[model samples]
Target: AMVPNVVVTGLTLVCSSAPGPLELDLTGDLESFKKQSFVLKEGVEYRIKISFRVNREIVSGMKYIQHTYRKGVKIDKTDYMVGSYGPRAEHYHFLTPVEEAPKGMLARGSYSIKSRFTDDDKTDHLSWEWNLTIKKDW
Candidate 1:
């Protein structure tokens, strides 16, 4: 049987006076209940969700409103599952173990995650970073 699990390893919060491009490095290890390869077991699924807390003043003020009409954030890759919420402070979520892990084995790996926000206000860019390790016990 496969179950959903979550472990938060690290968190980083940043405030930029000038926002152009932000890079977040996600690096960590996920300890398994049983020592196994870096692949997932069959009939199992996992989701990685990341959240960022943006400054309320940066999100609701005119400084951030001048660059883009529709302000939003996006992830760098598609291999992993990703979902985001909150401009009222801006947060992001990445779902993994994905829909593609193999059955009857544990999977573990290190990931480098990045984030970018597009809006009118490049100077008002606020960002955060986190490192997470996930494991599922059979």
Candidate 2:
């Protein structure tokens, strides 16, 4: 006897500029599934990519945050280590299914994504909340 094969039906990306939440809808039937909240899956895995196009006006006098880690562990508070780039808007990409994420986990519920700008002149902050759903076949 041969086992049946499964297929990935669809993938999607969504975003919102407001302080509210965004939703990701994966439409299709899945035989077996799992859900995850607040964190992504670990190890080798698939990804849903997202990019943020910053406004040049914002970066004109602002510094760009840099990415940093410590002893192989990511420093959550300072994950974004901006630099002298100023407030110009740039595209920032986040890779889901991060290396430290747990296996067999799915993305669900509310998550807060944030960006901050700072310079000798001033400091500013912005954020967006969002949700995601993933469907898989057995």
**Local lDDT at 31 for model 1:** 32
Clash totals for all candidate models: 17, 18
How close is each model in CA RMSD to the real structure?
16.2, 16.2
lDDT of 2 by residue, 30-138 (tens): 2222233223323223334333334334333433232333333444443333333322334454433322222344432223322233444654432222322222221
After superposition, the stretches of candidate 2 with alpha carbons farther than 4 Å from their true spots are 1-76, 86-101, 104-110, 120-122, 132-138
Best by TM-score: 2
Put down candidate 1 lDDT per residue, 11-120, tens digits, no spaces: 23221221222222322432321132122223344433333343333332211111111113332343322222233423343323434323332433322233332234
lDDT to native, each model? 0.29, 0.31
Where model 1 places Cα greater than 4 Å from the true spot, the runs are 1-43, 57-98, 103-138
TM-score of 2: 0.29
lDDT of 2 at 138: 12
